[PDB]
Amino acid sequence: DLSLSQGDWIAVTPPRVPELQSVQEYVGSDQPVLMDWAVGLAFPCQQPM
Amino acid sequence: VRIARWVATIAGLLGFVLSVSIPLLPVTQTTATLNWPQQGRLDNVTAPLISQAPLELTATVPCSVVRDLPPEGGLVFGTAPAEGRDAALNAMLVNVTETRVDVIVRNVVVASVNRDRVCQRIEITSNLDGTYADFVGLTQISGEDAGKLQRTGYPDPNLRPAIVGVFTDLTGPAPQGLSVSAEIDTRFTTHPTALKLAAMLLAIVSTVIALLALWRLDRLDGRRMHRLIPTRWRTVTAVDGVVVGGMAIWYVIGANSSDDGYILQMARTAEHAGYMANYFRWFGSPEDPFGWYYNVLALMTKVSDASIWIRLPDLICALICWLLLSREVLPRLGPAVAGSRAAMWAAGLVLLGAWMPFNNGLRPEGQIATGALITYVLIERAVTSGRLTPAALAITTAAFTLGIQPTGLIAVAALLAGGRPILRIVMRRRRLVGTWPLIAPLLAAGTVILAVVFADQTIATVLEATRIRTAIGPSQGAISRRVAFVFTAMCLFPSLFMMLRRKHIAGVARGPAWRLMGIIFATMFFLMFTPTKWIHHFGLFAAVGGAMAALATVLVSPTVLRSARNRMAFLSLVLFVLAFCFASTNGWWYVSNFGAPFNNSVPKVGGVQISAIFFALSAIAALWAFWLHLTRRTESRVVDRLTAAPIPVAAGFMVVVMMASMAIGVVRQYPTYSNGWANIRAFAGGCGLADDVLVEPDSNAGFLTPLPGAYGPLGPLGGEDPQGFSPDGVPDRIIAEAIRLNNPQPGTDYDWNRPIKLDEPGINGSTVPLPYGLDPKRVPVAGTYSTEAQQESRLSSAWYELPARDETERAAHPLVVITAAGTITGESVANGLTTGQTVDLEYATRGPDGTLVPAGRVTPYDVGPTPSWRNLRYPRSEIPDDAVAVRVVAEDLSLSQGDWIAVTPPRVPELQSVQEYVGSDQPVLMDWAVGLAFPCQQPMLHANGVTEVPKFRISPDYYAKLQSTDTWQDGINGGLLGITDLLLRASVMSTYLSQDWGQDWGSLRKFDTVVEATPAELDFGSQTHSGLYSPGPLRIRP
């Protein structure tokens, strides 16, 4: 924290090796999702609400 | 001849060589220093550097005062205050702490030696390649020894201090060794030596000799100047009387420009400073790369600087602009444009309509328009007469109009687009005389601009000003400010299409008409898109785009355009563009906007907006044109009678609506301050806006006495039931006429950085931080903001003893005011009667039986933003003649967490005008948007790199203050608020515009120092004669 300013700081939490899965694996085509207006074409498989 | 050619060529090349050598000549730079112990004493001394960047420090401190300070004893010296906003962030404070000493600069840590360690008179430096604050003869205890010399620092000019002075806490005679002797920045405050002055006088006399030699040599065709003031002049007609009388009436009552105060303020300070400083934005840098016209204004300001008088060039250049346009441009443009009355009438009304919004201030775009017209009509004279001396004058005139502003490239564009016949005239006179004595005075008059522009500025300092302006400056919407689309963009384009389609028209001279087009087109392609000057300009084309309209109106006249279809389509284009123009709000820049027909809303005559009326008539004309396209008539008279000169009809409508807007503005707001009444009253020796801005010098005096008994938990302000009216019912931090944002804003008050809760109970128990200098010991606050549960509090206060029944008391006590806070229903003029919470003054009467019957209430006015510490205003006129007491009533009918109010008891303030209180002695920091409105108070003029300490900060309206002004003047990009916010503490007071209550005129902030703050001695030495030697770059942002 080499900073004398009041608007500078950091926080830390211990490292992890997360059990990652793809979106299509986790969120299938059964659960409806609120796809926002800017991203519909990028996600073609999940049916919306 | 053979007696004029040789002097023409020797004086031509002599003027050339001399004028090009004028930037690289010596100048006597008058430097200044600052040695800290002045006469032995150890009082603090303030010398706020305008450029906030000394060249060197060379501060030396012995070991005798670090052990003689107290156990706390923090400031042996420093170049920021003891407590300033970002004091450690900008300046070199050097304090001692319990286990360390700091030589901290710009939040970059330097020599941190121990306290018990602290020694051979330790010397600190901060040069260009300095900041090595070294301890001579001392060895470090932890670390490497590096020869044991404690040479510690960072090689960097970026990290230099911003010297506002030098402040300490120790008092009494100087120890031998204590001497802070800084070199201040003195680059631009120079005057030319004897050599450079003699070179200037010789270049001027040599070019005038060369010009008169050219005039002598050129008279070989004969053609003597006979019958002066040509026969087409002196035939004055009704359009001349209109565009003279209406121009004079606009000169009196009309609007100013946006940057009127920006030019006026720097013109006022430039005489005493002596180098034409761009006062506000950059680090006192002279915009002397191109500013000579400001020296004309600076010479003009020797006499009184009333707005009626200092804008006299904007009247004179309008008159000679018209008198050139009607009498010398339009007859040159052809027999048809001169024969038709409608053409001269359109030229007059388009001139006046383009002149009146933009260049009736001090922003010098009337002079650029006039100079571009002069160089155009002179290049016309050169073509039509077959001479070369009007062209040679048009060269230096184009150079001067290029010299006024960087948006004076229209004059160069005119010289380029009239360059081909000039070069034909050169090739024409090449046969008889030598080619060289003709081209030589041309390039002489082209380069004599350098003699005037580089009068007291060396090329080094102008390139330094240029690189500061590109480093931190900008590197590349109203009913009558979007006119630019009306008066070139639908006159020059149809005239262009007509000039193209018809190869030879009858009555239009094709040559000068095409050069008139080329000026307007060519200026766009290297001024509109490439140059960085805010778009939306119409000033420049006020002159030459006036004559373009005179070209257009005879082109679209029924005698030239044979097809009625095209004429009816053009009338549809006229009405469409007028619909486009009226779409926005009738809003003038700053103080012109005082009482305007539709300053807040869209202009709506008769319910529906007039934009709809123009769009309906445009669609009617469009379908009437399309039906003639289908049926192919071309002969229906109805069109002939309708489209007979639509350009001067449109321009007459724009001129009349603008002059009506400002006439309604002046007569609406008559007993108060208008633009017109200010300019008329300026003859009486009165200030423009200062004479009728009532300010209370003592906010803590004038409070109304309550009735005999209070009867509550929180004073008489709570009358009977303070429902859930908690004493400290306010947010954690709200401030005087501003919104407390998280991140630090540039131009802030002292209240931003204060104790969150005040450390005293008070007379009420409320420990809320009070604004406006209000004491918490005397004026009991009373709010209702408790987030636990909104319980809807409504209190009727106790009755207050109003002042005595006297009209001489009533005069100078118009307002009864309460310093309320929170969201409150109030009748502003920025927006309508909006609805916050309902707090209002319930006035009462009580002759019969003594007891006060509450006979109605009065609505408040308000100007400040929604959750702020404003103060509501109730006119004593709205209070009836016999009313002996008033009681504020409130109501928190709101279940939302973002709603609340605060109340303070009413007062009858001892108001005085600004000119009465703030005279012409105390210097004030007039902001860039407001200089022309306040003509009498001298600003914080600066002398040789140091300024006078400002006392007040007169400022524009809140929105323009926050969004436009403070961003222009902060320390991050030069600025005056770099030095005053670091030194002074601003505390905004209350101010009221007289007889216009509910108008946010602006603000007035009283500065207060933080120490004793004696003015500095400033020992100056003035022998330095550089050629083009600029010692290093100034400190700018990283």
Q: What's the gap between Cα B59 and its chain centre?
A: 39
Task: Show the tokens assigned to B819.
Answer: 């310093």
Could you please report the per-residue DSSP string of B352-375?
HHHHHHHSSSSSTHHHHHHHHHHH
Tokens 């007491």 locate to B885
Residues 6+ apart with CB under 8 A from B824: B836, B837, B838, B839, B860, B862, B872, B901
CA-to-CA separations, B397 to B48, B161, B390, B391, B394, in angstroms, rounded: 41, 45, 10, 10, 5
Sign of the four-CA dihedral B893, B895, B899, B902 = positive
Nearest to B322 by CA among B296, B297, B355: B355
Closest-CA distance, A11 to chain B, in angstroms, reads 20
CA-to-CA separations, B147 to B139, B501, B981, in angstroms, rounded: 8, 87, 43
Could you please report the per-residue DSSP string of B292-304?
SHHHHHHHHTTS-
Contacts of B743 in chain A (CB under 8 A): 7
Q: Which residues of A touch B (CB under 8 A)?
A: 3-5, 7
Q: Please state, in angstroms and rounded to a whole number, the distance separating the CA atoms of residues B955 and B830.
A: 17
Q: What's the gap between Cα B404 and its chain centre?
A: 18
B1014-1015 and B45-46: which strand pairing? parallel
Contacts of A7 in chain B (CB under 8 A): 743
Q: Which residues of B touch A (CB under 8 A)?
A: 88-89, 104, 107, 109, 743
Q: Which residue does chain A place closest to B105, by CA atoms?
A: A4
3-state secondary structure B415-468: HHCCHHHHHHHHHHHHCCCCCHHHHHHHHHHHHCHHHHHCCCCCHHHHHHHHHH
DSSP state of B123: E
Residues 6+ apart with CB under 8 A from B918: B690, B924, B937, B951, B952, B1004
Contact (Cβ atoms closer than 8 angstroms) between residue B294 and residue B403: no
Contacts of A4 in chain B (CB under 8 A): 88, 104, 107, 109
Q: What is the largest CA-CA distance in chain B?
A: 111
For chain B, first and last CA: distance in Å? 63
Contacts of A1 in chain B (CB under 8 A): none
Contact (Cβ atoms closer than 8 angstroms) between residue B767 and residue B758: yes
Partner-chain residue, chosen from B104, B107, B109, that has the shortest CB–CB distance to A5: B107
3-state secondary structure of B173: coil
- Residue B411 parent element (H or E): helix B410-416
Q: How many helices (H) and strands (E) does chain B have?
A: 32, 33
CB pairs under 8 A between A and B: 8
* Chosen from B107, B112, B159, B742 to mutate, greatest number of chain A CBs within 10 A: B107
Q: Which residue does chain B place closest to A3, by CA atoms?
A: B107
- Please, after which residues is chain A broken with C–N above 2.5 Å? none
Q: Please state, in angstroms and rounded to a whole number, the distance separating the CA atoms of residues B862 and B839.
A: 12
Q: Please state, in angstroms and rounded to a whole number, the distance separating the CA atoms of residues B416 and B430.
A: 20
Bridge partners for B991 per DSSP: B695
Laid out side by side, the sheet with B1025-1026 consists of B190-192, B27-29, B1025-1026
Q: Please state, in angstroms and rounded to a whole number, the distance separating the CA atoms of residues B180 and B97.
A: 21
Q: Which residue does chain A place closest to B107, by CA atoms?
A: A4
Residues 6+ apart with CB under 8 A from B855: B843, B844, B845
Q: Please state, in angstroms and rounded to a whole number, the distance separating the CA atoms of residues B92 and B73.
A: 17
Return the CA Rg of chain B: 34
For chain A, first and last CA: distance in Å? 46
Bridge partners for B901 per DSSP: B822
Closest-CA distance, B67 to chain A, in angstroms, reads 27
Q: Which residue does chain A place closest to B87, by CA atoms?
A: A5
Annotate B604-613 with b (16+ C-beta within 10 A) or e (fewer).
eeeeebbbeb
Phi, psi dihedrals of residue B93, rounded to the nearest 5°? -95, 140
Per the CB < 8 Å rule, is A5 touching B109?
Answer: no
Q: What angle do CA B664, B1001, B747 make, to 5 degrees?
A: 145
Annotate B156-191 with b (16+ C-beta within 10 A) or e (fewer).
bbebbbbbbbbbbbbeeebbeebebebbbbbbbbbe
Q: Which residue does chain B place closest to A5, by CA atoms?
A: B107
- Residue B389 parent element (H or E): helix B389-404
Tokens 């003649």 locate to B881
Task: Show the tokens assigned to B146.
Answer: 């590096």
Q: Please state, in angstroms and rounded to a whole number, the distance separating the CA atoms of residues B860 and B855.
A: 17
Return the CA Rg of chain A: 19
Q: Please state, in angstroms and rounded to a whole number, the distance separating the CA atoms of residues B441 and B861.
A: 67
Contact (Cβ atoms closer than 8 angstroms) between residue B361 and residue B259: yes
Contacts of B109 in chain A (CB under 8 A): 4
Residues 6+ apart with CB under 8 A from B650: B486, B574, B577, B578
Q: Please state, in angstroms and rounded to a whole number, the distance separating the CA atoms of residues B397 and B324.
A: 15
Q: Please state, in angstroms and rounded to a whole number, the distance separating the CA atoms of residues B841 and B758.
A: 29
Resolution (A): 3.6
Task: Show the tokens assigned to B88.
Answer: 């450690």
Phi, psi dihedrals of residue B14, rounded to the nearest 5°? -65, -45
Contacts of B107 in chain A (CB under 8 A): 3-5
Task: Show the tokens assigned to B922.
Answer: 């105390």
Closest-CA distance, A34 to chain B, in angstroms, reads 30
Q: Please state, in angstroms and rounded to a whole number, the distance separating the CA atoms of residues B104 and B889.
A: 54
Bridge partners for B1025 per DSSP: B28
Closest-CA distance, A9 to chain B, in angstroms, reads 15
Closest-CA distance, B87 to chain A, in angstroms, reads 12
Task: Show the tokens assigned to B814.
Answer: 């118009």
